[PDB]
Amino acid sequence: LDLAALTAGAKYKGDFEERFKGVLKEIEESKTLIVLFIDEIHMLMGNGKDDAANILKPALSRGQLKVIGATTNNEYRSIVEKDGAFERRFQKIEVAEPSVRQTVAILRGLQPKYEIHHGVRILDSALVTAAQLAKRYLPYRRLPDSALDLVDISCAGVAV
Amino acid sequence: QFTERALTILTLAQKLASDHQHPQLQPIHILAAFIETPEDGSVPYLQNLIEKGRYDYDLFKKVVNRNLVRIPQQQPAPAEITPSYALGKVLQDAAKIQKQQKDSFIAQDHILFALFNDSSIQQIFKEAQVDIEAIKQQALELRYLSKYAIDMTEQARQGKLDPVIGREEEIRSTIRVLARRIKSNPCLIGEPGIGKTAIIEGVAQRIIDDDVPTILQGAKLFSLDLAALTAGAKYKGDFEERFKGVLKEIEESKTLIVLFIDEIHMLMGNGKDDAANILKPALSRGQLKVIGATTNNEYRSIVEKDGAFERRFQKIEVAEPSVRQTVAILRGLQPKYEIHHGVRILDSALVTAAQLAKRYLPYRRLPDSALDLVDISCAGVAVARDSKPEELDSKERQLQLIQVEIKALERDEDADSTTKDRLKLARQKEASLQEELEPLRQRYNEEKHGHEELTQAKKKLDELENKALDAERRYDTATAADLRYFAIPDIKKQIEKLEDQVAEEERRAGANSMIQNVVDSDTISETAARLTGIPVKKLSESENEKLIHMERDLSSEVVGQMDAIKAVSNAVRLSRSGLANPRQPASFLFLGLSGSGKTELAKKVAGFLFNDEDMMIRVDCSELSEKYAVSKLLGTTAGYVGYDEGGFLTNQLQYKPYSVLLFDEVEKAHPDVLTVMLQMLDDGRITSGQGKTIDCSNCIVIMTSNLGAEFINSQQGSKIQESTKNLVMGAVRQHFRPEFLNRISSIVIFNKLSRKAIHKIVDIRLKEIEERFEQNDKHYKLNLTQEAKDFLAKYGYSDDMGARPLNRLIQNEILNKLALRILKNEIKDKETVNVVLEECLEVLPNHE
Amino acid sequence: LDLAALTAGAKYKGDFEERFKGVLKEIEESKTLIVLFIDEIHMLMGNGKDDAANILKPALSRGQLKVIGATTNNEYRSIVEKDGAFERRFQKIEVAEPSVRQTVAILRGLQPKYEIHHGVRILDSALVTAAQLAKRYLPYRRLPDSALDLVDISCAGVAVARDSKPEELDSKERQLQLIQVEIKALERDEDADSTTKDRLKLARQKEASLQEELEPLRQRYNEEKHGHEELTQAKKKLDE
Amino acid sequence: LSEKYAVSKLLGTTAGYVGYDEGGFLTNQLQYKPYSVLLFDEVEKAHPDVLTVMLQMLDDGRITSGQGKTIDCSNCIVIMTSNLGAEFINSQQGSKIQESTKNLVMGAVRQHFRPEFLNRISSIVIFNKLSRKAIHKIVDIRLKEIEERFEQNDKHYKLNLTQEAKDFLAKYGYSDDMGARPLNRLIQNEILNKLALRILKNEIKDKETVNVVLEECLEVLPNHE
Amino acid sequence: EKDGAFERRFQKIEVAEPSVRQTVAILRGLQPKYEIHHGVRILDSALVTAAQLAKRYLPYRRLPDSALDLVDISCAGVAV
Ligand SMILES: Nc1ncnc2c1ncn2[C@@H]1O[C@H](COP(=O)(O)OP(=O)(O)OP(=O)(O)O)[C@@H](O)[C@H]1O
Ligand SMILES: Nc1ncnc2c1ncn2[C@@H]1O[C@H](COP(=O)(O)OP(=O)(O)OP(=O)(O)O)[C@@H](O)[C@H]1O
Structure with missing residues (x-):
């Protein structure tokens, strides 16, 4: 889930929340145990942020949304220093x-x-x-x- | 059938029919039930679909009240009587709405729609509920915290929350502080990962358990921060806007809300700058109940830099x-x-x-x-349940390969020829595997189902227990009693019957190889090792046994010095058992020849007891005078240049608490250092320039000495005998105060050892040297013969410097000679040793 | 008038200043003696001033601007030193x-x-x-x-401690609830007819005994609560 | 201790000098110890200026830390230790310090520590020689305490500190001239150690006994090993 | 100290x-x-x-x- 997902498939203020809480909602239910991933990976520090929980935590909690994340060594430290909730949600x-x-x-x-x-x-x-x-x-x-x-x-x- | 909200309303509606002593419950009473009281939290009345739609809640109420007056008031016997046909219809219609809406329990909202549809306040001064468009839009919009926080108390109310254990007082402590009229915000102080939010979860449980003082009991509890602090900003004030939003939204409708902050250190105030934390003290009296959190370390610096925090939050x-x-x-x-x-x-x-x-x-x-x-x-x-497809697929895969061969060869002309008709044997193998696969498969199915059913029963039990716990804390004695009235005991019995279905067999202690179980330390040590590296520590052995097995390796690896090893081993075992007073780190004096391997003994001890030779911490005691500071433990006193306190030793000890520390040629140490040594030999709380002590316990301290080296040089036995080892101890008694000697766990005496076994060291090093070449294996025809054995032990290994010169001879007579011929392209692979009496290598290729 | 007032709504250079000047204009016109106040004035000014209110404000040291500020010991010292204007525009x-x-x-x-x-x-x-x-x-x-x-x-x-008093009651109620629930289990059984579960009659002696204690413990509790509430409410009413 | 007596003592660090956390050892820790006690080991070896620095703690408790801050010493007890008067204490004039002897002791300290400091001390306390007449209580009481905690308790030693055991301690342990610390030395080197020789071999289920042999030494207990 | 430009415009x-x-x-x-x-x-x-x-x-x-x-x-x- 990426690029278009991040920005390119939209153009108005508020579109993020709309496609985010749209595609993720679709993903969250019925159609197999969907596991998502990011290709820009460090990107969660911008694609999560205010929605760092919303991107996953309640979607997992309400069902099966799972993700495979990724980050460089420096970016890992940054997502942890910035937030750290990811170390409760994810496994390094x-x-x-x-x-x-x-x-x-x-x-x-x-x-x-x-x-x-x-x-x-x-x-x-x-x-x-x-x-x-x-x-x-x-x-x-x-x-x-x-x-x-x-x-x-x-x-x-x-x-x- | 009905939600807690609908039940509240219907309880109230039926209640009102009896409070006003009416002949029957009517739509009016339900409307009145919705108008319970003008509570700020009154979703169906003050915040409702009419007020935010078309008509004033106050006037609507007055009409309803007039209707309650108009419905006749009667005696207790004619009073109340029935729910009424009118509402049998409204509530059934509400049920129809639930189906339309895909909701399993009746919502009070659905009652509002069904109810409203029947009613009609057709006054010229209309109060008739705004019609369905306004009503529905507002209903759909029902329910800052939703974007920045988690309602922990509601989570707790719904179950699906880990029980908090071992924090009962911490939970109560924060509740007590929250009860305060001012500066009522507690702050949890401690390292991250210590369960500081477990306390918060625990508070959430106390709230739903009604253990919380009433003034706090009626409050909600949220987990906040980050989303409104560190998540991101484009402009100045983006976080502060969110702060003000939450800081003031909390003062409207929702009784009282207790908030929780994940980390104060992220708030602080960026040089104050009208930012972050500075907005929190602003409401330290203004309700804003909040439990904060930070660390001991940062807390001190937060307070020192801020000056207000310590008066807003409790420590x-x-x-x-x-x-x-x-x-x-x-x-x-x-x-x-x-x-x-x-x-x-x-x-x-x-x-x-x-x-x-x-x-x-x-x-x-x-x-x-x-x-x-x-x-x-x-x-x-x-x-590990992978065992099912692992065994089945290894075989089924071969089966499939066989089936491929079968369809492949059947579809041919050579298929009739025995050339490929030998294929029938493949069919025999297909069948053979199928015969193995079926009982394996069924075994696995049974194994799976056994655990599965057990698990499902346990899950049912837990949910019955969650219901019982809610029923008990909310005083629903009917539900609690039913759950205790065999519902829970019976699921327990089912679990026990499922254990009978587990059917531990004498040959399989649980009839389920898919579920290996978390087996003690086998599963746990394996896991830890997979996560952290694989130490000796992984073994399910006592401290003495781990040590003893390693002592045997130590004795074998070190050439001679067995007496020394045993002296150390004895003291270490005493210490490992806890019999030695725990305040004292083990310590030894290694007395022998320079070049004797004393250092290596200590390194091997580190190599064993702490599972790592490179954790060794070393001290040069000869380059030492009255100023002993950074190079040691003390550092200079802070307030004096030399901030890297105990830069060499203290740092390693504090970052490697489980290690070995050496004092190299300690007899040369300045006398003042030796008095520090006395401090160091016991009472591990060794001082430093910053005032922080060492607390040396698990660090073995080994002092070394050549004080008696001349007596060792006497060669009085390959293991030093009486009249020789007594003289090296004599010298120790002359030099070292008895006070030092009375603290040292043991004075350890080393022996002189000839080439009869030192040659083993030489060979070990040669093996290491060739083996350590990570990128290749151009192995020697290691024709050391006797000439290299003695050359290396004659022009190399020294009674005063041990292997140091071996290493240098090897580097110069072997590796540097090798390097040159490699660059000359005279080696394609391997090389020939040719000791020529000094030493050299022959070129294996003919200078090719 | 500070903090949230100033920067919670300030994103671009000019937003803070707009908010602030907006207010300065309002307070300087028509509305009698508006007096403002600031708590930790250290927050103002900034590291090089760059007009965080303190450069705009001085004009009004003649033109009214009545503000009560507050600070402490050394932070005061450091801002006085860096400022030299507000320093002179108020009474220490x-x-x-x-x-x-x-x-x-x-x-x-x-x-x-x-x-x-x-x-x-x-x-x-x-x-x-x-x-x-x-x-x-x-x-x-x-x-x-x-x-x-x-x-x-x-x-x-x-x-x-007041709110912990139900614990005394709960030690008795928990026994009571274990008892009424166990009696349901003992009574709604076949072994209920057997002397095996007839022990429920003793369980009933115990639920009765617990209720005998709980009633006056609760009457006491409720009255004690009433004593707190009536004094609380009476004092509240008095102050009101 | 010298004029440097900074973070590791009282002076701490001041602006202009290396290190910020300051007065660490005493005034910082004391800042976070709302009531306390202190101990000054071999206080007579202290730099003489530092001996007078202590007057700020001795009374009117306003220690002046490197930052000019204080701890307001108040609800505390401070103990300073020295052996300057040992030459008179060691007069052996009974098991209680005597008149004149104690004055010579006060002489020794007033000729070393400034008397302007000493005279402000709540009291100068002179310790008495104890010797066998009460040391025989130290032994055994201390050992019980060691055993009371032991580790797992099960395998602790039931004391058999016979007069012979106590005699060993009297002859070597009770070093009334140099300190009776050898008693602790002997408990570990003889008792914890020689019992360890069997405990470490796991020869003991529970409890334990020590027998004694003269040239002080202990016997092997033939229930184990 | 930073400018120099205004200095040529004004009289100190x-x-x-x-x-x-x-x-x-x-x-x-x-x-x-x-x-x-x-x-x-x-x-x-x-x-x-x-x-x-x-x-x-x-x-x-x-x-x-x-x-x-x-x-x-x-x-x-x-x-x-
Ligand atoms: N006593 C306990 N009872 C129940 N759960 C506990 C207990 N102690 C710790 N935990 C759990 O262990 C973890 C440690 O919690 P803690 O709040 O200290 O983590 P943290 O500091 O929040 O780290 P983070 O910022 O990645 O959430 C939590 O996930 C908590 O659920
Ligand atoms: N008996 C022995 N057992 C194991 N190794 C030994 C023995 N004797 C000598 N050696 C080897 O020779 C060297 C002796 O090292 P040791 O540390 O004793 O030297 P040193 O006294 O530290 O002085 P320096 O490091 O300057 O030679 C070690 O590298 C060790 O491998």
Whole structure:
């Protein structure tokens, strides 16, 4: 539930409350045990706020509305320092960075996607090397993204 | 059939027929019932659908009163008589409305519509109820707090609220304060997560329990803040507008409302600036009953900076429950957890959770974490129901793979050839799995149903109990009696019969493998470990046994020094048992050679007793004079530069209360420090520059010494013998005051140990060194042979510096030699050791 | 006229000032001697002034603007120093803590307001005591208020105690209810005919005994409540 | 203690100097202790100016903290300790301090502490030697207290502090010349410890007994181990 | 300290504080304003003592404030 949900699908003062207490109300009942999530995630600090409870607490309390949230480490601290009620409603989960092995496994699973994306052959050792390099030259950047970007950028390059 | 509101009105309507002694109840009496009295909270009369519609409530009343006069007043025998056919119709019509509206109980509002439709005050001075459009719009609009607060007392009234346990006085304390005519707002003071809102929930319960003084009893209770404080703003005053809104709305209609504030620290007043908190003292006499909340730490700074808060709110302290109290709380919640999760829970798991949760959380509250440890662990067991699809799917999945093979191979020509007709064997496997799957499936269905029914019965019991509790506190002796009159005893019997259906079997202590149960510390330690890391502490062992198993590892890991280990072990066990006076931290004097491993012994002790070698806190006592301050415990006195008090040791001790502290070459310490040491050797309330003490208890303090190193050098046994160890103690007696020696748990004497076992250390380090290379395994052909065993123990390991030089020889003769040939691309994989008498590596590839 | 008056409605530069000037115009015209007041005047001015009322107001130091403000010790010092205008535009009035005797007189003046609110009675010596105790034991809160905290809190203690009196009644009523409910269970049974549940006759001796105590305990309770209420209401009516 | 006697004592911190929370140890904690008591350990070792600082607590209790704030010392009792007159106390003139002996004691303190301070003390109290004639009550009473709490109580030691047990304490424990603190030392090093040697092995269901051996030492109780 | 622009537009003029005697002269000039203000008479000597005494009294007031304060205050006192 996002983007349009946040702003883009509306344009008047008060529309937030109307689409919020509308789509959420629809979600809250009958049509399966709906679990929602946010893609802009930190966004609850703006998409909740006055409605930090209303977004979920009474919808859960009255039935089954559940959500899967997310936040960066800094944003987590911020939502807690700002509100903290989220630590009564939600359960904090750490998400790991994969090892080079795991990264490569991911790349291998998606390797044909990448080959399809550009009509380019990709060496298995390029997934290994890209993962090794990404950690070695950009250790502070997400390994699987960096490894992939290195590949998708270079794939695009040769395609050009 | 009817709501509490409708019942109130109809009770009143029937009452009025008898109060005015009328021949029958009429629509007029119901209208009069709605006009109970001109109460500010009078939804059907002062705030009604007519006043906010078309006609004046006061005049409407006068017409109704005239009609009450017009309906004849009779003697008690002819008085009242009946509800009347007229209202049999109105109330049945109200019931029809309920169906139209999807509402299971009759609303007084529905009565207003049915009632109004029959009636008609056709005066030229019409008071006839405004018609249906105004009436309905206003009805639909029935019922700032709705956007910024939770009505805790109504929640409590409806049940579905955890019982508050271990806060009975705190609850009463706030009620007492609220009764005050001025400055009647209590503020809960204490760490977050201590149950400070449990008190508030408890107050909500006291209100519905009618334990609250009448002056407060008639009030409502709300949970506020954040929504009107920190949620967000675009402009100056956005929060303050919401404050004023609530601060004044509270003075209209709704009797008296008690509010609750989650955190005063968020209010404070931003340099006052006509903001936030500054608006609260403004109404500290102006009703605004409110219970506040903050922490001990912030409270002091809030008051010091504000100057008014302490005269607006009362300082009500709240503290964490003891482990036993925590368990009592958990026990009250134990059956709730069982029905919440669909699992069974051992009482010992609550005990474990409270004990364990406290032990592993220097930075988190016990009741918070105990409640999560239990809710998580029992959720874990609820998740464990996965056992049903786990076993069934592992097999069914294979079955499906087999079925795919079957349809795949049947649809062929080679299907007739034995090439694929051997497929029939796949069909045998399909069938075999189906034969296993059916009794597994039915087993699981039975197991599921067993727990399911048990749970449902428990839920029914709890709701009957909630009804009984409401009936009792509201004095509905009829309902309470019926619930006690076997309704509750019978559901209990059903639960017991369901326990018979649990049918604990000798081979399965509960006929339900889906519900593993929260099994004591197995489930709880596992859960805690999954949440926090996996310590030795996870084990269901006594302090002595955990220690002893680790002592055996300690004895094995340390080369020689077994005598030293045993001396320490004995004292630690004395301390772990509580027999040693708890005020005293264990402490030892490690007397031996420099380079002897004394430090490592202490580190291993940390490695075991506190499960972490790196928690070791160390003190250089040789670089030490009369000014001993920051580098130690004392810090400089605040009021003097050196604010980082006890920067090195105090900080580590206070952030690692369970650890080991070393005094490296303590015999070199300045005499004044040694008197501090006496302080440090007992009575763990060791002072510091800020005035706060250490309270050293669970930190072992180990002083080390080379004072008698020369006697140890005598080599009088691989374990030091009499006439040698007595001389190192002699030197200790000469140097250290008896006063120090009389506090130290033990003087611990170390031995000189030759390469016969030090070589093991060398090998261990070599293993660590190659193994720690996180990114690879170009393992040596570790041809140490005798030449490296002695080279490393001859030009390396020193009687005065131990392994320090081994590490350096290895770095220079092995790793630096290796690094170069790696860069030369002379290594593809592995490498050859070639000690040449000093030491070197051979290149495994031919300089490739 | 402060706080909520000033900034609860102030979002944009100019909103506070509009609200404030609106009022200044109103008070300066037609309506006799309007006198305003401010409690913690420290709130005014701001860190660099930037006219949080205090730059606009001085004109009216000649042109009327009668305002009673209030402050304390050092916050006063710091704002006087930073201001230098309001500083000169008002008379400094030191307000000394009243003597203990004056405090008692205050407590006496307020005695009926405490008794009426709480629905309690107090002793005159209680008033004397609170003033003295506050002087002796609360040296961080000045007398009037400190002594009143002791009075209000003490009265609250009593008010709660009054409202806790139903506990004596409840210890008897709870037994009674356990009994009438258990009798329903014992009587509405087949074992009711059996001597097995005939024990309900003893349960009935007990509900009767409890009622025998509860009646006069309750008559007493109600009358005691009436004593509080009639005194409360009478005092309320008198003051009215 | 030196002129620095700041947060850790009375001076606290003042504007212009490091640290804000101030007078911590005494005046801050006292600020939050509406009634109290104090103890001054080896007060004669105190800096002499500080000895006179104490006059603000001694009477007219307006301690002047680093911020110029006070605690108004009033409903409190302060105990200062010293051994300057020990040379006369140790005269052994009975088990009660005597005339002249006590005057020499007052001499010693007035020649050290300013008398302008000492003369304002409610009283100077001279402790008497106790020795065996009453120390034999300290032993045993203190031990019972240790055992009264024990931990779980079940396994506590029923006292068997025979005259021999008390003799060990008399010979080594009652160090009337250096302090009888060795009694506490011995209870833990001999009793809690040697019983621990069996308790720690879980050889005891409940209760406990200590027997004595002379060269003071304890016997092994052959009910356990 | 912050501007510099207005400085090229205006002439800085220090305004001197009047002496006690000069202050008395202002009190005399305003004397009829005060007598009219409250409907009271004031002695010339009062204007004089006010100015001198005010200096002694109020280190936080300039002579014209301190003097006018005593005069207007006294007149107000008398008005009661
Ligand atoms: N004694 C008790 N009885 C019942 N429930 C309790 C008790 N103590 C604690 N709890 C529960 O444990 C938790 C601790 O409550 P507390 O109010 O201290 O949390 P908090 O400080 O409000 O944190 P937050 O700001 O994330 O709501 C609460 O969720 C409360 O329901
Ligand atoms: N008997 C032993 N058991 C275990 N390790 C030992 C032993 N003897 C020597 N060592 C090793 O040699 C080193 C001896 O360390 P120790 O701390 O005693 O040195 P030190 O006296 O602290 O002085 P420094 O750290 O400067 O060599 C340790 O790193 C340890 O692994």
